[PDB]
C-alpha cells in the first residue's frame, strides 16, 4: 500500500 | 539508556456517522509519547470525507510527528479498525520506515471506502463508534 503525507 | 520503541494507540471516535467534517477538514487525536523520557510526541489525523478530490470516496488517515529532540525520526506504522469483537480488520501497513520531522505526517489517503465503513452490515461502527488502532515501530530517534 502506497504511503503519502498530507502536506 | 531506555526507550519505548514500539507502541499501540487506540482511538474511539463516537457517533462517527454524524461527524460534520467535510473534505479536507481534519479530526485530530490527543498527543501520545514514546522514545527516551517521552521525548517523541505523536498524534493521529483523520479526514472522514477524504483529503482531496481523488480521495472523496475514502476516509484518509495519518500519523503526525509533533515533537522530537533531534531533526527527524524514522518509523514503521500500521493502521487498522477494531470491529465489534475488538478484533483487527482492514489493516494497512507501511512498506518500510518513513522519515518524520516535526509537523510532518505519513499515512494512507485512501485508507478505507466510506460507503463500506458506513454500511451497518459490515460491523465496523458498533453503536456508531469508529475505533482506530495505530501500531508504531521506531527505527531511529
Distinctive features:
heterodimer; A: 7 residues; little secondary structure; rod-shaped; B: 141 residues; mainly beta; Apoptosis, Tumor Necrosis Factor Receptor Associated Protein 2, Chain A; five-stranded antiparallel sheet; 10 strands; Speckle-type POZ protein (chain B); Phosphatidylinositol 3,4,5-trisphosphate 3-phosphatase and dual-specificity protein phosphatase PTEN (chain A)
What does this structure look like?
The complex is a heterodimer of chains A (7) and B (141). Chain A is largely without helices or strands and 7 residues long. Chain A has no helices and no strands. The N and C termini of chain A lie far apart (18 Å). Chain B is mostly beta strands. In chain B, strands 1, 6, 7, 8 and 10 form a 5-stranded antiparallel beta sheet that branches. In chain B, strands 2, 3, 4, 5 and 9 form a 5-stranded antiparallel beta sheet that branches. In chain B, a hairpin with a 5-residue loop joins strand 3 and strand 4 (40-47). Chain B is built from 1 helix and 10 strands; from the N terminus they run βββββββββαβ. Chain B has a single domain (4-141), classed as Sandwich (Apoptosis, Tumor Necrosis Factor Receptor Associated Protein 2, Chain A). Chain B is globular. Chain A binds chain B through residues 1-7, and chain B through 45, 47, 51, 60, 62, 92-95, 98, 103-109. Chain B: It comes from Homo sapiens (Human).
Amino acid at each position: 500500500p502506497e504511503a503519502s503525507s498530507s502536506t | 539508556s531506555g526507550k519505548v520503541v514500539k507502541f499501540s494507540y487506540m482511538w474511539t471516535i463516537n457517533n462517527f456517522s454524524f461527524c460534520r467534517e467535510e473534505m479536507g477538514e481534519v479530526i485530530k487525536s490527543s498527543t501520545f509519547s514514546s522514545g527516551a523520557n517521552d521525548k517523541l510526541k505523536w498524534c493521529l489525523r483523520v479526514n472522514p470525507k477524504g483529503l482531496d478530490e481523488e480521495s472523496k470516496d475514502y476516509l484518509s488517515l495519518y500519523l503526525l510527528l509533533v515533537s522530537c529532540p533531534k531533526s527527524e525520526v524514522r518509523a514503521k506504522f500500521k493502521f487498522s479498525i477494531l470491529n465489534a469483537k475488538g478484533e483487527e480488520t482492514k489493516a494497512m501497513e507501511s512498506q518500510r520506515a518513513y522519515r518524520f520531522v516535526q509537523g510532518k505526517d505519513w499515512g494512507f489517503k485512501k485508507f478505507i471506502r466510506r460507503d463500506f465503513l458506513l454500511d451497518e452490515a459490515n460491523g465496523l461502527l458498533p453503536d456508531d463508534k469508529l475505533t482506530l488502532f495505530c501500531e508504531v515501530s521506531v527505527v531511529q530517534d
